[PDB]
Amino acid sequence: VYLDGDRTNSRSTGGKCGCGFKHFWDGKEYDNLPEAFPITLEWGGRVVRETVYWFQYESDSSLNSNVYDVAMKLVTKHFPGEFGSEILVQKVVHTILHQTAKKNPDDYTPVN
Amino acid sequence: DEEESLNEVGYDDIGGCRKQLAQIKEMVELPLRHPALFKAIGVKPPRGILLYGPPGTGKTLIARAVANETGAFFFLINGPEIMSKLAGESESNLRKAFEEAEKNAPAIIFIDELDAIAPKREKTHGEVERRIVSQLLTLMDGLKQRAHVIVMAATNRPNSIDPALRRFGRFDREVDIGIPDATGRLEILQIHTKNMKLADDVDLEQVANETHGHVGADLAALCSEAALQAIRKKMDLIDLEDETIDAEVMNSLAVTMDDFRWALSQSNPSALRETVVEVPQVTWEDIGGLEDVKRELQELVQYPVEHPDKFLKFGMTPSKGVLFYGPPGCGKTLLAKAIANECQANFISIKGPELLTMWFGESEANVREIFDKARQAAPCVLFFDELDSIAKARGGNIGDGGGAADRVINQILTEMDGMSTKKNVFIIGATNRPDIIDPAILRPGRLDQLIYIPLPDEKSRVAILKANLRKSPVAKDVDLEFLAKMTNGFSGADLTEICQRACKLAIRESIESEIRRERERQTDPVPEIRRDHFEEAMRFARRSVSDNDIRKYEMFAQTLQQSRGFG
Amino acid sequence: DEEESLNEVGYDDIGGCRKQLAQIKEMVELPLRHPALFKAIGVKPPRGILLYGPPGTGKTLIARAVANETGAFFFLINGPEIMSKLAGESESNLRKAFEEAEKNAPAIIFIDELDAIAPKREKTHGEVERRIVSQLLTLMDGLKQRAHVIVMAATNRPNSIDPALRRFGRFDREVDIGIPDATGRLEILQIHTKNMKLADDVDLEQVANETHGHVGADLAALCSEAALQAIRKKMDLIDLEDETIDAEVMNSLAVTMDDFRWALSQSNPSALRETVVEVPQVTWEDIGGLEDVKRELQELVQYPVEHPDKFLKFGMTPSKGVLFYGPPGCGKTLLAKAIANECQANFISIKGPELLTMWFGESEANVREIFDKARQAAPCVLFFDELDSIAKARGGNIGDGGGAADRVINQILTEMDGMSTKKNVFIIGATNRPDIIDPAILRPGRLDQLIYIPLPDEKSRVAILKANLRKSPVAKDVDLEFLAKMTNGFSGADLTEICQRACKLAIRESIESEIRRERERQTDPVPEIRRDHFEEAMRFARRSVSDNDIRKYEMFAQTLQQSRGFGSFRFPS
Ligand SMILES: Nc1ncnc2c1ncn2[C@@H]1O[C@H](COP(=O)(O)OP(=O)(O)NP(=O)(O)O)[C@@H](O)[C@H]1O
Numbered sequence A: 001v002y003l004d005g006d007r008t009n010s011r012s013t014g015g016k017c018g019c020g021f022k023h024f025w026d027g028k029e030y031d032n033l034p035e036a037f038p039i040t041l042e043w044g045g046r047v048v049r050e051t052v053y054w055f056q057y058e059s060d061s062s063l064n065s066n067v068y069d070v071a072m073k074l075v076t077k078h079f080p081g082e083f084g085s086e087i088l089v090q091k092v093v094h095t096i097l098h099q100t101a102k103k104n105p106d107d108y109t110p111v112n
Numbered sequence B: 001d002e003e004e005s006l007n008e009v010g011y012d013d014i015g016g017c018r019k020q021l022a023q024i025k026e027m028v029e030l031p032l033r034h035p036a037l038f039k040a041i042g043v044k045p046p047r048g049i050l051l052y053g054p055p056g057t058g059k060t061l062i063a064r065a066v067a068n069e070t071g072a073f074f075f076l077i078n079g080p081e082i083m084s085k086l087a088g089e090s091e092s093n094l095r096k097a098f099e100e101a102e103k104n105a106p107a108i109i110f111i112d113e114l115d116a117i118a119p120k121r122e123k124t125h126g127e128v129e130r131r132i133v134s135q136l137l138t139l140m141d142g143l144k145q146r147a148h149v150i151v152m153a154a155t156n157r158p159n160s161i162d163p164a165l166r167r168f169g170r171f172d173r174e175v176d177i178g179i180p181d182a183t184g185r186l187e188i189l190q191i192h193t194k195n196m197k198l199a200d201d202v203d204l205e206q207v208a209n210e211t212h213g214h215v216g217a218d219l220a221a222l223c224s225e226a227a228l229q230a231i232r233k234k235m236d237l238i239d240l241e242d243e244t245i246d247a248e249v250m251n252s253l254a255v256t257m258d259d260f261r262w263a264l265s266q267s268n269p270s271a272l273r274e275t276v277v278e279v280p281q282v283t284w285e286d287i288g289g290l291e292d293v294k295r296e297l298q299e300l301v302q303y304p305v306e307h308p309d310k311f312l313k314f315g316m317t318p319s320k321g322v323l324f325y326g327p328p329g330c331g332k333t334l335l336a337k338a339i340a341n342e343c344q345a346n347f348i349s350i351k352g353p354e355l356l357t358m359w360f361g362e363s364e365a366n367v368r369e370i371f372d373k374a375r376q377a378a379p380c381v382l383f384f385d386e387l388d389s390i391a392k393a394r395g396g397n398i399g400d401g402g403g404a405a406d407r408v409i410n411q412i413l414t415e416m417d418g419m420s421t422k423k424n425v426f427i428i429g430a431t432n433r434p435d436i437i438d439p440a441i442l443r444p445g446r447l448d449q450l451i452y453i454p455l456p457d458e459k460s461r462v463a464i465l466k467a468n469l470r471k472s473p474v475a476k477d478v479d480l481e482f483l484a485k486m487t488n489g490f491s492g493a494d495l496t497e498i499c500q501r502a503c504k505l506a507i508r509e510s511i512e513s514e515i516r517r518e519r520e521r522q523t524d525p526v527p528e529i530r531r532d533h534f535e536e537a538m539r540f541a542r543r544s545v546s547d548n549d550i551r552k553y554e555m556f557a558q559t560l561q562q563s564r565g566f567g
Numbered sequence C: 001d002e003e004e005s006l007n008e009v010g011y012d013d014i015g016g017c018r019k020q021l022a023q024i025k026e027m028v029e030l031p032l033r034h035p036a037l038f039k040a041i042g043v044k045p046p047r048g049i050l051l052y053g054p055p056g057t058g059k060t061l062i063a064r065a066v067a068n069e070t071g072a073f074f075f076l077i078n079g080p081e082i083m084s085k086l087a088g089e090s091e092s093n094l095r096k097a098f099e100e101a102e103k104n105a106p107a108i109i110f111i112d113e114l115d116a117i118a119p120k121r122e123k124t125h126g127e128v129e130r131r132i133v134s135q136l137l138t139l140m141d142g143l144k145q146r147a148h149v150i151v152m153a154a155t156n157r158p159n160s161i162d163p164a165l166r167r168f169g170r171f172d173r174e175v176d177i178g179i180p181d182a183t184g185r186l187e188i189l190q191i192h193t194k195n196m197k198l199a200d201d202v203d204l205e206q207v208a209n210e211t212h213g214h215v216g217a218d219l220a221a222l223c224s225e226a227a228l229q230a231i232r233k234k235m236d237l238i239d240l241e242d243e244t245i246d247a248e249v250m251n252s253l254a255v256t257m258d259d260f261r262w263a264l265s266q267s268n269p270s271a272l273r274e275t276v277v278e279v280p281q282v283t284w285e286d287i288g289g290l291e292d293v294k295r296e297l298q299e300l301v302q303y304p305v306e307h308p309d310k311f312l313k314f315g316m317t318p319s320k321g322v323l324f325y326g327p328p329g330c331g332k333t334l335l336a337k338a339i340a341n342e343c344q345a346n347f348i349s350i351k352g353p354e355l356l357t358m359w360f361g362e363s364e365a366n367v368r369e370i371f372d373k374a375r376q377a378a379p380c381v382l383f384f385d386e387l388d389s390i391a392k393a394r395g396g397n398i399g400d401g402g403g404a405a406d407r408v409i410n411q412i413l414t415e416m417d418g419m420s421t422k423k424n425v426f427i428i429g430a431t432n433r434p435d436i437i438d439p440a441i442l443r444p445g446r447l448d449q450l451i452y453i454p455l456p457d458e459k460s461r462v463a464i465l466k467a468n469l470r471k472s473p474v475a476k477d478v479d480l481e482f483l484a485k486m487t488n489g490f491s492g493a494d495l496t497e498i499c500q501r502a503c504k505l506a507i508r509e510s511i512e513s514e515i516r517r518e519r520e521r522q523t524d525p526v527p528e529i530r531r532d533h534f535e536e537a538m539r540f541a542r543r544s545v546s547d548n549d550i551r552k553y554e555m556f557a558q559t560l561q562q563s564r565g566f567g568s569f570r571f572p573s
């Protein structure tokens, strides 16, 4: 099987890596490599640290990362069944959206 | 005068007032027709009767009706008529009445506008008004010599009379003439449309149903407006001016249903911003599933009233409240109306916006009024929706320096703790955020039972779909069972949304077809909802609650269950 | 001599009020001229009519018109006049009037200003005033269909009369004479200017369009000021203010359009702060693109008001409001105005500052009044702009720690959940921050429909550019298609700004050329906009909505669409 982000036989289409091969990540076959951003959670006293991977440059429009789903998954995985946790969802959405800005079209530093 | 003699009102002209009319007849005719009877039992007859009610509910109409049946004696006193006289003459006027009625046989004295002559003492500045109030008090007190005289008075609202006139021996008794219900409006319409030619197409039942917040005066105005529009619609093309209308177009004048619809459209009801106290029209047939909850709710509101002797024998105090908690929309509001309908008891509903208004406006003193309306209309069911609204709006969970206590729920608890069990006033609360409810509410004696309303299962989903569709035509090929098997997670409102979307699509198609067919005229395609409309409507369907919220509610319920370990 | 009989008040003099005049004819003339008609049906005619209206709208004009154009006996009772008499004599006069009118028949009685006769009872600081009010009440209740006597009254405001006078058998029927519209103002101007001598370039339609808050008295004052300006302009140096004026200059007087423009400049409308209730003048042509949204709006608003039988047949409750969300400045108000115009329904607009005033002022009770006004103008469309303004003020994403609930939105919810469905009062809200809105609004029975208004595309941009240029005389040589192709991420406001800048540059160039030419001659170069201007105006073009701001809206719409994942449902059959 494919582990992660390897030079698969599938041909990359418009990828910025330049190898011409697609990349594998979390059970899916992607073109480029994601970035990484740190996020802190502090709901209900407990504090956890996490990293978020963001996909912004891609060929198909159904594959680019969606904030309202990434934040929902992050909250559910670490705070399952907590009452009134949508405030944390809104806060993390705002934080990731603010810190994912692309003011200059050169902030592309994908993780190895 | 000929028509005036035979147009005098009587008992037959009163509409929905049946219990009130019986009470008035009991408190007046009996102490006068047979004075000796009250001496045999020993109970003293009443001395003063006061009539409540918003404007235009027939308060003075009952006066004229009474002064036709009780043919003993009647003297009428008007508020403005008394107050319009010169100072000194007004005071000298009342005395005459109170001796004239004393000189003759058992008599009735009716004061029409009581608040016009006896307002609040401190709220009114003057000299002659205080003298008039004192004169009235002195006459009513001195009329105790039992000359078989009963004094009646009417007012728009009790909390405007001088409280000295509400004591024992002076207007002690009271009769409340409230807003008519659905049947009362129909009866009033039938009374009003007696000498008025109509057509066969109009049915008064629909008109009675649709006119929601009207009173007798509003119904009379609606009938007059309908007649006027009937005149304007058709006959107005003949009779212009300065002429005499021939009988051919006079006798051949009728009122149709469209005229009533128009008159209803252009009508603003008076008593609209008031709480509706009536028996609900929702039965167990409109609720799918929830079999256990129906029995648990019947044995809490119905058993204590049906079998008081059983409760007295075993000395168990009946429960006074119950709290419903669950996901947003499963039938929590339906259950309260259903249980109020089965026992045939009045229902009073208080929603979350009312509580938020009382919280923002610093008017928590209004709650003292609400329970009063519930106390008079006993038996009654009091329903509070979104008890967590205040806590949610104040930050929620650990959102600020609070402790889950506000200025409105405190008043609710204070008023609920002072309820006598002799009067059956059951209180039901509803919420979907049980974690932030005030723990003081759940203390025994206020709201003990805590019932969990879950998401419907397959059989309940089938029942819900069948119950929400028995109002519109449906083709026989539709298979509701497959829909219920396929949804698997919708709440009680998503199915209603699906049905509404299907009806909307059918309406669109029918209107489009009619427009298309109305183009060849210058040169029922869809009688029932088909099975292809539901397929399209299912595309715009979404789950209201995700599995995470189900997880939250399941965790709460399982913690409560694990806390209760016995056996 | 006494040629005042030629100057009277007829039904032709009352301009701009035709519906109210029709109602007055219905309920004041028919009952007492054909008494048997109501007897045959059996309904009782009204025994009192009240007239509303802001000051200077024509309440007393209708009194004189009815007085001299009925033929029935008419008695006039002035408000202040009856109160100026000595105590005791006022009651004698009132009783004498009510008894003398009853002797004749029919005996229409008009009370001019009863707000000075019967004020609020608690505000009746005194004793004789309450006696007068009680005397009025007693006489009114004594009209047991006696000789068909009808009583009329006029007031500047309903909420200044004793509430005892608005009961059954008393003044219960009311008329709502209000602010005139453009056609009404034009009719009033034509009525007033029927005697003075106008010039040949005076188009009263332009004057009627330009005046906004005026009422009949204000229009009369405007005409008087125009006449005064005409007199002062040229005849001032000929007139001498002595002896008599020459007949030559006296007869030869004309009021030009310049005088009317000057008079309009020196005008102070007395109804500027009132709420405008009128049918919008915007049609579907002013809006480019957004074809589907027009169809959805027509379905939501127009169908339930035209085919009630279809809704009754299938047992469906019509929707009662929509909520627009999208980037700022894309047509969220033009759509509301157009949908109000198509159905010929009145439009009442409540803006963001109006809401913020009540939140700061702690006067949310005024919200009730708004929902009364719409109830008096059915069918009507009620538009709330920037519903998130209060939420935006309270911090925004990170607020003061409170919940998503405030003082004004709660009152709006309370009032919306208590309106009869028989009335046709549609409710529309608009918000460009759909994530901070109160979730309680979106519940069923409320503003539950969500419509997304996106940024315009290339074809829609062509449509917008063509629509906005119907005023500027642009030369037929510039390719608007090229401008639409080049400008990609622009909203409607940006295109409007581009057009405005082009027009401003053209105006400046024309003015400069005219000044230079006149200076040269002391010893129309640009009658239309040409290509170069639009080039220069293109340099001052900026995108109102950034590229990183549309991500929020696009992702929100994508999630709302993705929540519906049952499009593969198929019956077995
Ligand atoms: N129950 C009823 N049945 C039939 N007609 C009714 C009824 N109630 C009211 N009406 C009609 O509506 C009118 C209401 O006016 P009225 O009886 O004066 O009410 P009110 O405002 O309580 N009177 P007042 O005592 O002067 O304050 C009646 O005169 C009838 O014409």
Ligand SMILES: Nc1ncnc2c1ncn2[C@@H]1O[C@H](COP(=O)(O)OP(=O)(O)NP(=O)(O)O)[C@@H](O)[C@H]1O
Residues within 6 Å of the ligand: C013, C014, C015, C016, C017, C054, C055, C056, C057, C058, C059, C060, C061, C112, C113, C154, C188, C191, C216, C217, C220
């Ligand atoms: N529809 C109209 N057409 C022409 N003139 C009008 C109209 N309405 C008002 N006016 C002008 O307004 C005058 C009448 O005063 P009005 O507008 O009735 O003021 P009011 O303060 O409402 N009346 P009142 O309080 O009874 O003195 C007329 O004589 C005209 O000068």
Ligand SMILES: Nc1ncnc2c1ncn2[C@@H]1O[C@H](COP(=O)(O)OP(=O)(O)O)[C@@H](O)[C@H]1O
Residues within 6 Å of the ligand: B286, B287, B288, B289, B327, B328, B329, B330, B331, B332, B333, B334, B456, B463, B464, B467, B468, B491, B492, B493, B496
């Ligand atoms: N078990 C059920 N049976 C029939 N209808 C239901 C059921 N649950 C919900 N509904 C429908 O949902 C609508 C509103 O639900 P409601 O009871 O007001 O929700 P909530 O309990 O949150 O107040 C009702 O019109 C009703 O038709």
Ligand SMILES: Nc1ncnc2c1ncn2[C@@H]1O[C@H](COP(=O)(O)OP(=O)(O)O)[C@@H](O)[C@H]1O
Residues within 6 Å of the ligand: C286, C287, C288, C289, C290, C327, C328, C329, C330, C331, C332, C333, C334, C463, C464, C467, C468, C492, C493, C496
């Ligand atoms: N679809 C459109 N077609 C034509 N003009 C438009 C369109 N959308 C916006 N405009 C321009 O925008 C201006 C009004 O903007 P508005 O709709 O009030 O902004 P918002 O939607 O933020 O309230 C008008 O002058 C109009 O010319």
